[PDB]
Design a protein around this ligand. Structure first.
Ligand SMILES: COC(=O)N[C@H](C(=O)N[C@@H](Cc1ccccc1)[C@@H](O)C[C@H](Cc1ccccc1)NC(=O)O[C@H]1CO[C@H]2OCC[C@H]21)C(C)(C)C
Lengths: 99, 99
């Protein structure tokens, strides 16, 4: 579909068996989800934005479905105020910017 | 144009007559540029992102040309790690997400 930018581009995602709302973010290198209890091994990571860095848990080869489009990649979990879908997964769903 | 996301969507902007590189950022409500001298009146503000809040100078009704497309709107100037073009201006240049 086509998503205009008058409002935050929030869409429904499916991850770890749960439905969530997430922001499609061309300004994010990584995908970062609000605190949730995913199984498996993880590695610590620090990610940086406006204001500074937060500590997150890095999970690899995680399946996320974004508006019916499936993607598999690295998913970070930590104290973000918003679920963010970053470029690592947006490329997998064929998402482009157009003007 | 159509822009894929395997790299950061950086573009050249012109503001205050000066050229700069900026990130097309659908995850930002607002446009935030690195410290610079801009002509016009400004008001102090704060803006928050991942990591926390920073202090910025809000300039309203500023002319800015984004990859050959003109916009006139609000620009926040402060110690952001990257120049980001947010949805307030992305909408003015007709930018959408598509997949
Ligand atoms: C390599 O570094 C990255 O990829 N970092 C990513 C990152 O922070 N990306 C932001 C742009 C960016 C890139 C690189 C350095 C600094 C800033 C942006 O795309 C998403 C955030 C999300 C948000 C956070 C809090 C509250 C609401 C929304 N938005 C934002 O900060 O927006 C500001 C400006 O507008 C306002 O609206 C929202 C808040 C205000 C990562 C992976 C941490 C998400």
């Amino acid at each position: 579909p086509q998503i205009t930018l008058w409002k935050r581009p929030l869409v429904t995602i499916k991850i770890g068996g749960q439905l969530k709302e997430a922001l499609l973010d061309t300004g994010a290198d990584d995908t970062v989800l609000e605190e949730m209890n995913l199984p498996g091994r993880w590695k610590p990571k620090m990610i940086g934005g406006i204001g500074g860095f937060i500590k997150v848990r890095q999970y690899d080869q995680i399946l996320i479905e974004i508006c019916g489009h499936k993607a598999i990649g690295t998913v970070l979990v930590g104290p973000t105020p918003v679920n963010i879908i970053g470029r690592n997964l947006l490329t997998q769903i064929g998402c482009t910017l157009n003007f």
